[PDB]
Design a protein around this nucleic acid. Structure first.
Lengths: 58, 83
DNA sequence: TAGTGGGGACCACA
DNA sequence: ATGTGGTCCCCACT
């Protein structure tokens, strides 16, 4: 049995993994590698930080 | 740039990059080639990151998380272009 | 029948 | 003791 935590979301508990489409993954990993991060999670942290102005308009 | 494979799945050119066909049939997902070599298209977000990311996905109204990553990359284009 | 998204499990580790 | 990152199979669907 797996012991990975899920997170609370507006639609219920959610697994912490995401599958990226091929084109999205290629662009995402370009960002991650240009940032020098070993863990993808740190790259989406950075994307969320840099997209904050747009996110707040949602 | 050149090579049929890393040495390995068949390397297939796509728009903006290259994908790698599955090397077997029990799992037929393609991988992608990146500056650090072949990579899986699936990533695990830390709990803190996942919560924020799904909030963005849910506020966008998107069914698939990959589309929310697309949106984030677009909205970050300014910061990305400066490295 | 070739590639998909996403569930469950597992390795190695703390 | 209860998580971790990352990935291996697998199921349903195309």
């Amino acid at each position: 049995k797996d012991r990975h935590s899920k997170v609370f979301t507006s639609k219920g508990p959610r697994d912490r993994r995401v599958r990226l489409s091929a084109h999205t993954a290629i662009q995402f990993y370009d960002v991650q590698d240009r940032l020098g991060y070993d863990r993808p999670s740190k790259a989406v942290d950075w994307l969320i930080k840099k997209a904050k102005t747009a996110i707040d308009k949602l | 740039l050149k090579g049929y494979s890393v040495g390995g799945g068949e390397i297939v050119e796509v728009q903006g990059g290259h994908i790698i066909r599955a090397t077997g049939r029990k799992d037929r997902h393609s991988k992608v080639f990146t500056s650090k070599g072949p990579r899986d298209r699936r990533v695990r977000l830390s709990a803190h990151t996942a919560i924020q990311f799904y909030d963005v996905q849910d506020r966008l109204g998107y069914d698939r998380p990959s589309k929310a990553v697309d949106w984030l990359i677009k909205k970050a284009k300014t910061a990305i272009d400066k490295l």
